[PDB]
Amino acid sequence: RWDTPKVVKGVSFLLRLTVTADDGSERLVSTARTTETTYRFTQLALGNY
Amino acid sequence: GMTGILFSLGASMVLGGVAQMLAPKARTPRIQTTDNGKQNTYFSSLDNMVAQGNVLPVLYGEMRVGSRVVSQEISTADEGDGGQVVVIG
DSSP: OOOOOBBBOOEEEEEEEEEOOOSOEEEEEEEEEEEESSOOOOOOOSSSS | OOOOOOOOOOOHHHHHHHHHGGGOOOOOOOOOOOOOOOOSSOOOOOOOOEEESSSSOOOOOOOOOOOEEEOOOBOOOOOOSSSSSSOOO
């Protein structure tokens, strides 16, 4: 969850989830464009992200 | 001296219509295909327009109508209208 900033007319929130790889790179898992503030994920594995 | 060529014109004016000789007749707007088949009113604007090109309009009675928006802004609200009643849970 977060807070809405001072946007002019329309608010949309883009959410991008990345996972740190074993060697040190990044891995992209899913993306979303929503309007509600709170978001909930589900069925996450591995470690740091 | 003489003032000739009166050239009575009573006949020419009727050529465009007789009801127009007593009433200028109301103007009519044009039809935009893009606005489906709706007919634009010349004295009412239900839609709320943008405050820029449109001149400051005038009202003359009743007519729930739109407006010309000057500033729209969305932020984060406060939890509590006022007083000491400020519960959250």
